Amino acid sequence: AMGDKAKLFRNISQRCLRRGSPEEALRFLKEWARHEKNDPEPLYQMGIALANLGDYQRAVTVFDKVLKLRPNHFMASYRKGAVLLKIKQYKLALPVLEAVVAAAPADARAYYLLGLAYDGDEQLEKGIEAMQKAVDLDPEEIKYHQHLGFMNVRKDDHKTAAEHFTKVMELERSQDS
Ligand SMILES: [Cl-]
Numbered sequence: 001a002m003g004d005k006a007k008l009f010r011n012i013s014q015r016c017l018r019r020g021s022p023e024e025a026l027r028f029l030k031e032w033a034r035h036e037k038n039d040p041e042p043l044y045q046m047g048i049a050l051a052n053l054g055d056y057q058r059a060v061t062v063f064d065k066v067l068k069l070r071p072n073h074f075m076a077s078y079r080k081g082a083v084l085l086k087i088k089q090y091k092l093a094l095p096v097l098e099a100v101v102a103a104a105p106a107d108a109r110a111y112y113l114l115g116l117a118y119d120g121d122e123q124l125e126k127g128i129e130a131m132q133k134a135v136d137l138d139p140e141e142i143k144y145h146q147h148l149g150f151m152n153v154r155k156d157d158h159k160t161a162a163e164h165f166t167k168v169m170e171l172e173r174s175q176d177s
Contacts, residue, residue, distance in 0.1 A: 009035070040066045043069070063076050064080070077099055108134045111130050
């Protein structure tokens with residue numbers, strides 16, 4: 001069922017993304033979409049390009065189109081959640097990211113973005129919960145110890161904050177050796 005036209009445009013879109021030129025890639029992803037309408041994949045790709053170009057509000061709108069077509073499109077929720085966070089729309093990113101983690105309950109990064117969303121919404125305790133899951137799921141990652149440390153600072157538990165920051169540095173000494 002995939003047209004020759006659709007194949008051509010996909011092919012050109014990929015070269016344009018692979019030569020780091022998403023401005024051009026967009027023009028051709030829109031063509032793929034024109035021909036295979038209701039294929040969510042070109043829309044999903046448009047979303048990615050739009051997010052690299054930093055037109056975040058437009059990227060959310062396209063990710064919503066793909067989610068209207070495939071309500072459980074798990075990557076489409078992931079990336080929507082991740083730009084909703086960058087935009088600082090924390091309240092609206094929370095249900096999205098919480099759905100990603102239900103699909104992918106060992107994805108450390110999902111839980112990190114979730115913690116940052118909760119933290120931004122002044123749900124400090126739920127932010128700590130989530131970041132703690134990310135640290136347990138990937139204890140070598142430095143970012144997750146950094147944030148968990150500061151979250152503990154904000155709650156005036158300077159003991160547990162210290163613990164995490166000491167670990168932050170052990171990781172840093174260990175990335176030269
Ligand atoms: Cl933080």
